[PDB]
Amino acid sequence: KRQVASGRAYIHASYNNTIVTITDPDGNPITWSSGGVIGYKGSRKGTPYAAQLAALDAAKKAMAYGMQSVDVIVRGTGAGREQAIRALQASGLQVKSIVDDTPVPHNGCRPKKKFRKAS
């Protein structure tokens, strides 16, 4: 319900889908979007094109609250991650900074099987 100049935008792209959520100087959401939000569904969400429209529709909404300079944090290896960053920069928003903070266990709890496959 506020309107901040500088903000933040998160990228989450799992091989199944890509979600982008725009926050503020603290990380408290302003709006978001992703594959399904756009109009796509199912497999056609992990798709890069999907990611594109998303990041756009994402910031496209952010405009309402007046967003301009916003860092960027990426999480994933999505078969459609770049388009997110791109579509962002190429928007009425200035990609004030791009960082990659994809979580990663320092070898902790056993993973599933589709992943444990590495041993």
């Binding site: 960053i85 960082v99 990659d100």
Partner: protein, 70 residues
């Protein structure tokens, strides 16, 4: 490229307190770098890490921060 071992004189690689001295072996995200980029030997790279870790425990050396700009 620039070998880490080079850029420094006679240092006590078992000095778990010399920030920069050690601070200059952690890739760009904290990853304790390989000999292929530090240039130490077997017995060195070893005693190095052992000490590099010690420093990480004391808030001196980081654990990881993911380099900026991607």
């Amino acid at each position: 490229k620039a070998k880490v071992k080079a850029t420094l004189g006679e240092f006590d690689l078992r000095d778990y307190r010399n920030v920069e001295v050690l601070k200059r072996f952690l890739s760009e995200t904290g990853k304790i770098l390989p000999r292929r980029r530090t240039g130490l030997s077997a017995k060195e790279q070893r005693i190095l890490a052992k000490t590099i870790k010690r420093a990480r425990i004391l808030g001196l050396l980081p654990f990881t921060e993911k380099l900026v700009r991607k």
